[PDB]
From Swiss-Prot, chain B:
Residues 1-177 are cytoplasmic. This is Adenylate cyclase type 2. Phosphorylated by RAF1. It comes from the Eukaryota. The gene is Adcy2. It comes from Rattus norvegicus. The protein contains two modules with six transmembrane helices each; both are required for catalytic activity. Isolated N-terminal or C-terminal guanylate cyclase domains have no catalytic activity, but when they are brought together, enzyme activity is restored. The active site is at the interface of the two domains. Both contribute substrate-binding residues, but the catalytic metal ions are bound exclusively via the N-terminal guanylate cyclase domain. It is found in: Membrane; Cell membrane; Cytoplasm.
Length: 176, 177
């Protein structure tokens, strides 16, 4: 009867998607009607998850995946954790790369990062899911969906905090 | 990669497209918390339909934000008519009626935008951390497309599924009803 909620302020949320994966996936003979593609995707995600085990990213929290899109976040308990999220996205790229050269593919990550206040919480009676709701999230997501392949799009606000840390963000502020 | 294969499963993407506009985070809004409570109320009410014998064959895959994803046909007892496609339409009507009972109690005017499609699907769990089950495939990406390109308060359905629906009794424009 009670809605499980906890508010957090200043959490960096990332939406790391592989926009060309929907084109790749095919279903027919060679693929086994899709099964070969899901295995690759399963391979890609499980490899990304493996980064979470690195002490370097002990503060990163995988929320879940939406299809091939990966959602993570630092801050679920200033700026260090915002810089950690950028290091994690770089780490996702490098893992996607190690996969592209083993599976003979050319996948590219399109990351969208943003920080701010958030409300984590569980919705629904059957099959309850823990999301991160809010505007900083819908904006983190917007950075991704309007982002650029192989690049990390970041809002004007977050770009500054990043500079405070050391990341030179190209001005539409991107980073690599 | 645990996976299973199913042929002919009706998958529905029932979304509330105006909810993103509604949501806000202010003084008179509890920085969003009041909105999540409404959404939590809307989803938990939808889930309550699954308990109806009428929909014992309906299975909730997940919700994506405010979007609800369900499906008939995943019943896994190695049996491989088009009744379960008609069940999915009855379930979407049922989501509308529950959304309505909520609009009149919370003084809102939310509208559901449903996308239904049937076909072969691969249910499976992906990811080491927070592994999550789904329904992958083209019938799914199409069920989804029916939703995302759908019309408020209407159920968009592909040419193929529209026919099966007529075989069952559903009036079909060029949208079930
Ligand atoms: C519920 C609120 C609102 C407005 C804000 C929000 O946090 C979201 O739930 C996120 C961003 C957020 O929950 C992260 C997951 C996902 C799937 C990316 C959501 C959707 O984009 C939602 O939009 C829809 C239409 O569900 C959105 C944007 O809706
Ligand atoms: C992984 C495969 C592929 C190509 C096919 C598929 O089944 C999907 O995973 C669904 C449709 C499917 O898993 C149902 C949930 C949701 C959220 C609707 C998925 C996304 O639209 C995926 O797209 C993305 C871009 O992640 C998509 C379409 O990607």
């Amino acid at each position: 009867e009670e809605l499980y909620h906890q508010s957090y302020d200043c959490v960096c949320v990332m939406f790391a998607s592989i926009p060309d994966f929907k084109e790749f996936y095919t279903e027919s003979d060679v693929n086994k009607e899709g099964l070969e593609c899901l295995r690759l995707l399963n391979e890609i995600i499980a490899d990304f998850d493996d980064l979470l085990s690195k002490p370097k990213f002990s503060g990163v929290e995988k929320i879940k995946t939406i299809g091939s899109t990966y959602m993570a976040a630092t801050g679920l308990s200033q700026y260090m954790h915002i810089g950690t999220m950028v290091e994690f996205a770089y780490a996702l790229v490098g893992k996607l790369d190690a996969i592209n050269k083993h599976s003979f593919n050319d996948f590219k990550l399109r990351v969208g990062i943003n920080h701010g206040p958030v409300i984590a919480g569980v919705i629904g009676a059957q099959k309850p899911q823990y999301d991160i709701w809010g505007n900083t999230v819908n904006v983190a997501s917007r950075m991704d969906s309007t982002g650029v392949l192989d690049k990390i799009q970041v809002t004007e606000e977050t770009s500054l905090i990043l500079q405070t840390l050391g990341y030179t963000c190209t001005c539409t502020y991107f980073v690599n």
